[PDB]
Amino acid sequence: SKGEELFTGVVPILVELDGDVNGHKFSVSGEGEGDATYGKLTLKFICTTGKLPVPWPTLVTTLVQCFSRYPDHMKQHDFFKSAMPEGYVQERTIFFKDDGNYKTRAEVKFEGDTLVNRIELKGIDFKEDGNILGHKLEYNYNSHNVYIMADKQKNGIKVNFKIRHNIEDGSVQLADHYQQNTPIGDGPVLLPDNHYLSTQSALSKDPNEKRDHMVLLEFVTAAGIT
Amino acid sequence: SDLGKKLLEAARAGQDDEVRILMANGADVNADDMFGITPLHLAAMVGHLEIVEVLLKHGADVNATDLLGHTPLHLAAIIGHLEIVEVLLKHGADVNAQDKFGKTAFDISIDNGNEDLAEILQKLN
Ligand SMILES: C[C@H](O)COCC(CO)(CO)COC[C@H](C)OC[C@H](C)O
Ligand code: NA
Numbered sequence: 001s002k003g004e005e006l007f008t009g010v011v012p013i014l015v016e017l018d019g020d021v022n023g024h025k026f027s028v029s030g031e032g033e034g035d036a037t038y039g040k041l042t043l044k045f046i047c048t049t050g051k052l053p054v055p056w057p058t059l060v061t062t063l064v065q066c067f068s069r070y071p072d073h074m075k076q077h078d079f080f081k082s083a084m085p086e087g088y089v090q091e092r093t094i095f096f097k098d099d100g101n102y103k104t105r106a107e108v109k110f111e112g113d114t115l116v117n118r119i120e121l122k123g124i125d126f127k128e129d130g131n132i133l134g135h136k137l138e139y140n141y142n143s144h145n146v147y148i149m150a151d152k153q154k155n156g157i158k159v160n161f162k163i164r165h166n167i168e169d170g171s172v173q174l175a176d177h178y179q180q181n182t183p184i185g186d187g188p189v190l191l192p193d194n195h196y197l198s199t200q201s202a203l204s205k206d207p208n209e210k211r212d213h214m215v216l217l218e219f220v221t222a223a224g225i226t
Numbered sequence: 227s228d229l230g231k232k233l234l235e236a237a238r239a240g241q242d243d244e245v246r247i248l249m250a251n252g253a254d255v256n257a258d259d260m261f262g263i264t265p266l267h268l269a270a271m272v273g274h275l276e277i278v279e280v281l282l283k284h285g286a287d288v289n290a291t292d293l294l295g296h297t298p299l300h301l302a303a304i305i306g307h308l309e310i311v312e313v314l315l316k317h318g319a320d321v322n323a324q325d326k327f328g329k330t331a332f333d334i335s336i337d338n339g340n341e342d343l344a345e346i347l348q349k350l351n
Pocket of ligand 1: 102179180
């Protein structure tokens with residue numbers, strides 16, 4: 001696609017989330033860089049409203065799949081970059097097993113020469129002493145398969161996967177993700193064959209940062225077609 | 227520190243004379259960002275052979291790991307830069323190194339359809 005040309009080098013990223021979980025209102029701002037030729041993302045996020053009322057790991061999927069690497073044999077299947085620069089809307093429902101759910105709407109597009117992910121998130125029905133509002137999640141992340149299929153009739157994609165969140169007692173909290181992406185522009189997009197993304201994420205801290213924050217390194221590569 | 231940041235950005239950009247001057251002026255060859263990425267990671271990833279050699283000759287850690295446990299060799303397997311793989315191995319890179327999710331450079335090569343690189347790596351066991 002013509003959109004993939006915008007990603008051949010290092011692209012600056014801004015992420016801006018406004019959230020409300022069980023009435024707890026919060027905001028997150030992130031900035032960093034994406035290097036899609038290598039499937040590489042590097043971001044730092046800050047809670048601009050004080051302490052984050054939910055665990056940082058629960059927000060990772062919400063907080064730019066256009067920076068996935070599509071290997072040479074898969075380039076025709078990269079919807080995300082084909083939608084650029086006008087971008088796409090990314091919606092999800094995330095069901096935390098035996099707890100509440102997040103619903104999210106994001107616009108991902110170029111604003112000037114920066115890729116910007118702007119999100120609204122609403123969470124409901126969380127248990128006050130459950131793993132999310134009780135902060136029982138380990139500060140860590142697993143490696144996932146993100147399954148993608150075309151919705152040719154609606155000129156976009158449908159996506160589904162479960163995130164595994166390690167709990168401090170050795171259990172695992174599942175978060176079942178239902179996702180749709182829809183182009184913002186009228187231009188043609190690439191509608192993929194079924195495939196998946198293989199994801200890797202690591203979470204850290206900046207020893208110089210005093211605000212509630214998360215350092216995130218990711219590497220993502222598309223797969224499932226030979 | 228300031229020199230470290232500049233060294234990272236020169237390595238990513240393939241600015242070989244900038245790398246050489248920064249190191250002559252005392253930049254730490256093993257400087258890393260908050261993501262654990264070093265100059266050698268960046269040069270190996272992008273395939274900048276002369277920069278990789280300069281860094282290694284000045285003592286770049288061939289076994290450095292980012293936050294995900296990727297070594298420069300892991301990153302060189304994404305595009306499959308053979309001359310860089312060769313140099314890294316000649317400087318003692320561990321061909322079997324696993325990232326924090328257990329992946330090797332062989333595994334990365336296969337994911338990317340780098341079939342020839344995968345064959346090379348396999349023969350080194
Ligand atoms: C059907 C199954 O229970 C999961 O439900 C998914 C669904 C309805 O099919 C539940 O809301 C839709 O979720 C995905 C969409 C994109 O989310 C829309 C909005 C942002 O919550
Ligand atoms: Na947390």
